[PDB]
Amino acid sequence: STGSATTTPIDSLDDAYITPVQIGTPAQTLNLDFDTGSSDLWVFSSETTASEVDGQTIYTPSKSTTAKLLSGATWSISYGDGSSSSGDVYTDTVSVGGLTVTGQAVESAKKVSSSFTEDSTIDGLLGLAFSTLNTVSPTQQKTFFDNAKASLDSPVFTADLGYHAPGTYNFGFIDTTAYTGSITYTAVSTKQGFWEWTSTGYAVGSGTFKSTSIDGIADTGTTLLYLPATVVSAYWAQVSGAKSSSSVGGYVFPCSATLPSFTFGVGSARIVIPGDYIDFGPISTGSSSCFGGIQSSAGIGINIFGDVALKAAFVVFNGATTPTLGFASK
Template identity: 45%
Template sequence: MAGNSSSGLADKIKANILKFCDSDHNKQPDEPTEPNKPTTLPTTDTSNMAGTFTKIPVKRNPNYKAHGTKSYVYALARFGFNPTMDGPYHHSTKIAQQGKFADHAGQKHIGGKLRFSHGLSKKASDGTTGQVSSDDIQNDSLYLTPVTIGTPGQTFNLDFDSGSSDLWVWSTELPSSLTRNSKHNIFDPSKSSSYKKSSGSTWEISYGDGSSASGDVGTDNVTIGGLTIENQSIELAKKLSSAFQQDTGDGLLGLAFGSINTVKPNPVKTPVDNLIAQEDIPKSAELFTCYLGSWRDTADPDKGESFYTFGFIADDLTETTGEISYADVDKSQGFWNVKSETYTINGKQATQSGNTAIMDTGTTLALVSDEVCKAVYGAIEGATYDSTQQGWTFPSKTTADHLPTISLAIGDKEFTIAKEDLGFADAGNGMLYGGIQSRGDQTFDILGDVMLKNIYAIFDVGNTRFGALQRTEPSVNLSIPPSTS
């Protein structure tokens, strides 16, 4: 189990928080809050934060290759939902056995216990069904963020994922045949004086395609953008399936809530849990923020750059925006789940009563109901559902004035997805794979990078709410996504 962060962390936060707290954002616990009411963005002078709080630059993975179907299959494997539109990929149930086969009169009988195994399958063109291979799925991360672990620090490029709660890294516990010539940064606990092994604790992540990662657990110091968490639980990879081996990143840092952490026999405190564990840290500092850029925006003022912050909200965004709209978060399933009951296409609003959405930095696409998908692509001339690619596509020659203006609700306010983000990847034959796709029979929307690139996202842990600030693009770049985004 992870311990508390250092008192030095609390002192740093208290010293810096005075630079940006305002009366609304710095409410005391006994003051009522209005989660959905737009508020003035608190400002922060980050120029004087060297050595304390800084923006954490996010690297765009140079090896990432945008592929619509593979990204969709990744979401299928990860969340386990069943597709409601035709396509080669689907979930199937198989009978597995625990025990041995017995041969009686030439007939095979299963001994031991029966169990049902749910997995992702692929239907071939001849109608036969087979297993999904690592080549069928997007196994690489688009965004990677540096994190330092141990004493002295060892630096790793991790996938920051607000849809999961494990912090795992490549480690020396992996077979030497895998690490010997690897380009990954490998965590060596023997070289950290602050590392402690957590006896008896193990972890395992497994997806519907059969891919998995697992290993042992320890605690160590973790530094993220000038913020150090002592005795943070670290999950050391001991086994990685081929799909996990293909990822350019050195592991994952989950930013969801601890209830979906996979450590056994007892879940551990996540970095998010430890962020709010300090009783003397103001609630206004119990947050992290996310600003994701795009390869299309290199000519824009932000140069397409991306960053995270922990403990403060960046002030420079107030120059062009200035208001955050907050939405209550339902964390009962471990996700950043918010109400999302309306959407607007070309000025015409529609309602989906009771609909919700999770804000997920670990998913590239925006996955919504079939109703919304049909409305979106019904507004684009020449758009069609391509069952061979299991996704909606539209002509790459479509100009900006022929693309719809689409807004999705986060809480009580709608946020617009830039037209340039409607095309996710080249689908061949003069078509683009859409950035908005079907969530299948999933009961909530999954708003990934396609939406998050259009807002400044505030994950307010202390107040259990999600804040969003609309971003606008000074220009529209409809270039066909390159093979390496």
């Protein structure tokens, strides 16, 4: 089997991407944030505290003939950005782009934090990291990809995120028309539960490539590119007037600037992030100070190749017995 679904930016800055997902019988379609940095499939639901729902589409398990309460199971997750959610668990039929999993754990939110309430466009998350990170207790549950894997034509999914445009998540096959050149594969460590890999270095604009190992995670659920302070300082030093602002919480730059590209290494290959991908717009409405898309990972504890980086590439999440990641230009 295979599946193929379009993923769409939630706003004009590509702050996140939503992908339609069918849950239950008859189908209830919710727009979920596919997140390779977590491993819970959770949804706004008929059980979510009413004051914490503001425009999201909800899953109502009582209206699904295939929903079954997973007795005694609860979940609670807090994303390293400070947001959080928690609730109880059903199993139900879940389909993405024509690929169906029966008995998928669907985590129904009873509580969500304010940042979720305040985002009416995201109806939940679909985790695609390794199932060892799944928070369901007392019986940990498998991700959609892990449940689907043995049925797939090939045990892979691919992320092809667009810049200010829709893109695609594919399951079970590699669309050879969706990238240029070849796919370069690189080793993954699963020890922390993430798609963790080591970039071989970077370049700023037309500058020379610096060979240096940068350990990080491939995280579709993070908007920006978080890299060591040395690398980020070298990048922003090429932008007249850019500075790190403690009051704003990162590097900002004059909205009148044209930004240089940023290149990262994948083995001997190179992925080029165009400068425009690094512009996240005014820090507040009407401001001429713009927020940067490359920020320091100091204090996160890991580097994060978020959407800014991933959208410059066609990315293969290879879930074979020994997982690997693949990157191609596009």
